[PDB]
Amino acid sequence: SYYAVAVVKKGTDFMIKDLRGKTSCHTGLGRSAGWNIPIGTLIHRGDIEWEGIESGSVEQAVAKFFSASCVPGATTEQKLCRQCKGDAKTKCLRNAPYSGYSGAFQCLKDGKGDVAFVKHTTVQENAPEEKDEYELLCLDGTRQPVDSYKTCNWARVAA
């Protein structure tokens, strides 16, 4: 099992209720911490307006919420590929540079997103000496340190 977390930089100040219009980094379309949990969570909060497949695709609803994102594997909305790093033609593929837990974290690090949807070991694995420059967005409207994932995660995931 792992925990799904939302990583942000200590320089910013927005909370979970303020995500509309920000830029986002995801591990890839359809993955647990990078898509299913965060998108699902926002739909239920009522922040992302989707009521059912008859109100469009999930992709279109997300592209209207974030100003732009990198979502490796996205199929219909080019806005979901706009922050992706790489060659014009392969940047948004499932195995592209900002794909995966590492690649999504690197997208936040390089300033291409305001938030990365990754898992609880991600920051320690990829930036152990810079852990203090990041924090997590909690469901209750606060921020907590990276090592506080147990009390600041969006869900526990089966894997």
Of 82 and 122, the one with the shorter C-beta distance to Fe ion is 122
Of 32 and 148, the one with the shorter C-beta distance to Fe ion is 32
Residue 152 C-alpha from the chain's centroid = 15
Is 121 near Fe ion (CB under 5 A)?
Answer: no
Phi, psi of 98 (to 5 degrees): -100, 20
Q: How far apart are CA 3 and CA 18, in angstroms?
A: 22
Q: How far apart are CA 106 and CA 97, in angstroms?
A: 9
Site string for Fe ion, 2-31 (x = CB under 5 A): -----------------------------x
With contacts defined by CB under 5 A, how many residues of the chain interact with Fe ion?
2
| Residues 20 and 115 sit within 8 Å (Cβ to Cβ) | no
Q: How many CA atoms lie within 13 A of 37 on its CB side?
A: 23
As measured in angstroms, the least distance from the Cβ of 31 to Fe ion is 5
As measured in angstroms, the least distance from the Cβ of 141 to Fe ion is 25
Is 32 near Fe ion (CB under 5 A)?
Answer: yes
Q: Which residues sit at the interface with Fe ion, rule CB under 5 A?
A: 31-32
